[PDB]
Amino acid sequence: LIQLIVSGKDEQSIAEAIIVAMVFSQEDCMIKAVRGDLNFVNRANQRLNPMHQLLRHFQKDAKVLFQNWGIEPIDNVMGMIGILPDMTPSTEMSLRGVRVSKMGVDSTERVVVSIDRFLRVRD
């Protein structure tokens, strides 16, 4: 995860966005942060989606994930205060590559595209 800038309305939303980005990164510490009983095959032994299983497990509890992810030094980045594993805002330290913006940054546009013979869609 090179960088992540979140703009959640409340701490819970910020945590959800951070966890989703963390899992989407597929980082090794993310994978190694799994703790407890997490099964990637259902009772029928059908293979579950590992990404969804990790999302569910980390949304159930994310303390271990934030503890094992890392902290990065943060300067006084205007309107980009850092966030700490305990979910309290911080200025000097933050989760590695994670910043919180208060500008409420907020895509839906449908761009017309051309699709070639081999189903390659180019703008």
């Binding site: 945590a15 959800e16 969804h52 569910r56 949304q59 159930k60 509890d61 994310a62 305990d86 979910m87």
Partner: peptide
């Protein structure tokens, strides 16, 4: 406005305490 098309998983997080 801002909306989620399809939200899987249980959501939330116990880290917030």
């Amino acid at each position: 406005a801002a909306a989620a098309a399809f939200a899987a998983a249980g959501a939330a997080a116990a880290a917030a305490a």
